[PDB]
Amino acid sequence: AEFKAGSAKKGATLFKTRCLQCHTVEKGGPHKVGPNLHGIFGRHSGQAEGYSYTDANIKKNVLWDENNMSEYLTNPKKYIPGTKMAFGGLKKEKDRNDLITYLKKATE
Ligand code: HEC
């Protein structure tokens, strides 16, 4: 994928309505169904302290950035086979760009 900054505003709504049930973004935020995402863009997959990852997510060992995050969010199970993230993906590129524009800011 090739990330292009979009609407952080739309991204925030997308996170709230598509991700928040399983993820928090704030520093010190709790793990829920999925791991807290604070600092995700300075980290490899499967490395958030305090979260119980699948071996699949850990072994993928993807150094998260705006580009492979877009690739991942297109189809998480195709990108990380065996992951337990029950999310089909954001198929529209503009949605992924919006979400990641927000996530880059929100997870710092
Ligand atoms: C529950 C129903 C989830 C929804 C909705 C979303 N995610 Fe998720 N995510 C979930 C789990 C259980 C996991 C761990 C998977 C595993 O195999 O252990 C994840 C993982 C991620 C990651 C990787 C985090 C890391 O490696 O530290 C990312 C970057 C991520 N999820 C992002 C994300 C976004 C942006 C979502 C909304 C669009 C989203 N997830 C939905 C559970 C669930």
Curated annotation (Swiss-Prot):
One of its GO terms (cellular component) is mitochondrial intermembrane space. Heme c binds at C19, C22, H23, M85. Pfam families: Cytochrom_C. Methylation may enhance its transport into mitochondria. Methylation occurs in fungi, plants, and some protozoa, but not in animals. The precise role of methylation at Lys-78 is unknown, but it seems to preclude pro-apoptotic activity, possibly by lowering affinity for APAF1. One of its GO terms (molecular function) is electron transfer activity. Induction: By oxygen at the level of transcription. Expression drops rapidly when the oxygen concentration falls below 0.5 uM O(2). Binds 1 heme c group covalently per subunit. InterPro entries: Cyt_c-like_dom (IPR009056), Cyt_c-like_dom_sf (IPR036909), Cyt_c_1A/1B (IPR002327). It is found in: Mitochondrion intermembrane space. Keywords: Electron transport, Heme, Iron, Metal-binding, Methylation, Mitochondrion, Respiratory chain, Transport. Its cofactor is heme c. The modification N6,N6,N6-trimethyllysine is found at K77, K78. It comes from the Eukaryota. GO terms for biological process: mitochondrial electron transport, cytochrome c to oxygen; mitochondrial electron transport, ubiquinol to cytochrome c. Present with 7330 molecules/cell in log phase SD medium. Electron carrier protein. The oxidized form of the cytochrome c heme group can accept an electron from the heme group of the cytochrome c1 subunit of ubiquinol-cytochrome c oxidoreductase. Cytochrome c then transfers this electron to the dinuclear copper A center (CU(A)) of the COX2 subunit of cytochrome oxidase, the final protein carrier in the mitochondrial electron-transport chain. Isoform 1 (CYC1) is the predominant cytochrome c during aerobic/normoxic growth. Belongs to the cytochrome c family. This is Cytochrome c isoform 1. The gene is CYC1.
